[PDB]
Design a protein around this ligand. Structure first.
Ligand SMILES: *[C@@H]1O[C@H](CO)[C@@H](O[C@@H]2O[C@H](CO)[C@@H](O)[C@H](O)[C@H]2NC(C)=O)[C@H](O)[C@H]1NC(C)=O
Ligand SMILES: [Ca+2]
Ligand SMILES: [Ca+2]
Ligand SMILES: [Ca+2]
Ligand SMILES: [Ca+2]
Lengths: 4, 292, 303, 67
């Protein structure tokens, strides 16, 4: 997934 | 008079003295049948070569274990070769099919490899990065990469990439490919637009990324992707395709299942939500000029 | 005189009767075992990915669990299977010999001892890899080549039938090739078992003890005599029929390749030839005691 | 005048040897059968009984003490  | 007495004890004696001689012969026969070890089902094939396709081209017909020695390799190593009737030989470098092996490994382990190789292709493993590099860059001949996935309902999907190559350890075994070549699992290595953030996709693509493990951070995050998601992979703040992740019995898992709060499963976002983990995975390469 | 007790010796009849009954039972057992042998035992030892020259190089390449591995000491040798112990005192030990349940015959000729025999490993409860070592002798050609790659140490562990154990560490270990009859050499001892290989049985004195020293001896098998018992009589060889292969002198203070007597304590009337041919280590349990567990592991010294 | 004792005392010398040979054989078969465990599909479970031989062996040594 993505990281802020 | 003890007539027959001493005459009977002589019969018994002489008799079970002839039985002893006979029983000994039978013993030796038994000893002869207990000299061989237990039969081992796993056996290695004689044929060898640069890669599986080379081994295929030399007559190999069945899938199994072979030794191969890429051009620039200084030693031969065992690999699992998938060979079908059409004459195509695949060199498999990654397999998941039951959470029996732990993929939370360090840099050296992902380099040298870990897990086990079976003649039946029924075991989990990671051929090392060093070998994957030697195989895919041994010559100019371009290699293709095929990713196979199976969900918890028998459905399978694939993803193909052309000009697949893994660089040297000098460049953290960087991942590279020219372009996505199709497949119904979707091009997850291209990144995925997860939500509101205007740069989700840019942050989750994989082409060009270096390999990362908890003890050797080479990602584009300020923290440690490999450490959080607990795996070894080509991270980028972090990922959208994660095949060496945590195996979750049944695929479906949640944020509460993880310890850091992030999706750490075996995902492929273009095919399934990141909260669903694959039941089977396979990564293999074959000379590109073999699919075209 | 009269028939006092000449009629009393009827106890001679029960001994014979009983013995005849013992023989019936024995034949039945040998016959049943013969049947069970129509099919062999099997193992599925899937091979670990990680590999190297030997177990030390493998534990440095990430191989953390004790199990069967495939090694290739040299580019000219065909990769072979061996059991690596990755937990005993720093790990990285290549098992060369192992005893633990009497499941394998050790009284073999020169050829089998040269090629190696027995089971390297067996499958664990419910796993796809072989994490349990079996009983085996790696083979003289292989052992020889391994100890000559560079400085090599040897560790010998053993256990009795009470659960107690001891060990014999030899900082230096070498085994020459076949032309040289696999001559043995060991040094830098330390441990809790007695230094049997270099000093001989500790219960003896004079030339009686020095004749049970193994260091410097050639390898012998009941079909190839190279012991230190120099003599013409063909019926006086340290390695008798069904005796193990070993570096006998005249004859021994220890014998890890001896016959596996169940229970430990054995006598001369139990021994096929009346000699102590069991798994022995005199400097610890004496001469008529056979161990429950015995093993030999090697590893590079470092230099 | 007799003609039985000189034969008896000799026969019991042979029965002694047979005991010893039986003891060794009993043990040998016990070791060999266990050796198949690492080769054959299964091995026969069995408990050798030395105590039995021990007694008869001790007993027969009583008679040889007479004449
Ligand atoms: C040293 O060995 C000798 C021989 O094995 C023992 O002395 C005697 O040697 C003669 C052979 O010519 C025989 O009477 C016996 O073999 C021995 N008799 C004894 C003393 O039992 C001697 O005992 C040994 N020394 C020890 C005890 O280690
Ligand atoms: Ca977006
Ligand atoms: Ca970072
Ligand atoms: Ca034998
Ligand atoms: Ca001799």
């Amino acid at each position: 997934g993505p990281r802020p | 008079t003890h007539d027959s007495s001493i005459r009977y004890l002589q019969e018994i004696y002489n008799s079970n003295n002839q039985k002893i001689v006979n029983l000994k012969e039978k013993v030796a026969q038994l000893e002869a049948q207990c000299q061989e070890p237990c039969k081992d089902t796993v056996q290695i094939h004689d044929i060898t070569g640069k890669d599986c396709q080379d081994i295929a081209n030399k007559g190999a017909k069945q899938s199994g274990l072979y030794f191969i020695k890429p051009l620039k390799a200084n030693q031969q190593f065992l690999v699992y070769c998938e060979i079908d009737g059409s004459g195509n030989g695949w060199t498999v470098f990654q397999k998941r099919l039951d959470g029996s092996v732990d993929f939370k490994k360090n840099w050296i382990q992902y380099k040298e490899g870990f897990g086990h190789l079976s003649p039946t292709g029924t075991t989990e493993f990671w051929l090392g990065n060093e070998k994957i590099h030697l195989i895919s860059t041994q010559s100019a001949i371009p290699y293709a990469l095929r990713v196979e996935l199976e969900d918890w309902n028998g459905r399978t999907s694939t993803a193909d990439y052309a000009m697949f190559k893994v660089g040297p350890e000098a460049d953290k075994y960087r991942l590279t490919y020219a372009y996505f070549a199709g497949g119904d699992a979707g091009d997850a290595f291209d990144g995925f637009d997860f939500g509101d953030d205007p740069s989700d996709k840019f942050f989750t693509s994989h082409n060009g990324m270096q390999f990362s493990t908890w003890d050797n951070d080479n990602d584009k995050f300020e923290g440690n992707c490999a450490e959080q998601d607990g795996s070894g992979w080509w991270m980028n703040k972090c990922h959208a395709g994660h095949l060496n992740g945590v195996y979750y019995q049944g695929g479906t898992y949640s944020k509460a299942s993880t310890p850091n709060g992030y999706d750490n499963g075996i995902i492929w976002a273009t095919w399934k939500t990141r909260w669903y983990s694959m039941k089977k995975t396979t990564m293999k390469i074959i000379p590109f000029n073999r699919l075209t | 005189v009269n028939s006092n007790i000449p009629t009393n010796l009827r106890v001679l009849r029960s001994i014979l009767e009983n013995l005849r009954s013992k023989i019936q039972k024995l034949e039945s057992d040998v016959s049943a075992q013969m049947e069970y042998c129509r099919t062999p035992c099997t193992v599925s030892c899937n091979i670990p990915v990680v590999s190297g020259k030997e177990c030390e190089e493998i534990i440095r390449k990430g191989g953390e669990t004790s199990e069967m591995y495939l090694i290739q000491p040299d580019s000219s040798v065909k990769p072979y299977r061996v059991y690596c112990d990755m937990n005993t005192e720093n790990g990285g030990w290549t098992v060369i010999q192992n005893r633990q349940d009497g499941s394998v015959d050790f009284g073999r000729k020169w050829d089998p001892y040269k090629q190696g025999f027995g089971n390297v490993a067996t499958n664990t409860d419910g796993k796809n890899y072989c994490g349990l070592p079996g009983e085996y002798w790696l083979g003289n050609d292989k052992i020889s080549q391994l100890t000559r790659m560079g400085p090599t140490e040897l560790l010998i562990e053993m256990e009795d039938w009470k659960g107690d154990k001891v060990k014999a560490h030899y900082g230096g270990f070498t085994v020459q090739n076949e032309a040289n009859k696999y001559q043995i050499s060991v040094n830098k001892y330390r441990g809790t078992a007695g230094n049997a290989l270099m000093d001989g049985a500790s219960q003896l004195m004079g030339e009686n003890r020095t004749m049970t020293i193994h260091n410097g001896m050639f390898f012998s098998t009941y079909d190839r005599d190279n012991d230190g018992w120099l003599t013409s009589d063909p019926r006086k060889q340290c390695s008798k029929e069904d005796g193990g292969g070993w570096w006998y002198n005249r004859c021994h203070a220890a014998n890890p390749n001896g016959r596996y007597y169940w229970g430990g304590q054995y006598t001369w009337d139990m021994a096929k030839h009346g000699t102590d041919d069991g798994v022995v280590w005199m400097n610890w349990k004496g001469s008529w005691y056979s161990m429950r567990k015995m093993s030999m592991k090697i590893r590079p010294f470092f230099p | 005048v007799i003609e039985k004792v000189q034969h008896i005392q000799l026969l019991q010398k042979n029965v002694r040897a047979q005991l010893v040979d039986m003891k060794r054989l009993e043990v040998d078969i016990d070791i060999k059968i266990r050796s198949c465990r690492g080769s054959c599909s299964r091995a026969l479970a069995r408990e050798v009984d030395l105590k039995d031989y021990e007694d008869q062996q001790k007993q027969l040594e009583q008679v040889i003490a007479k004449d």
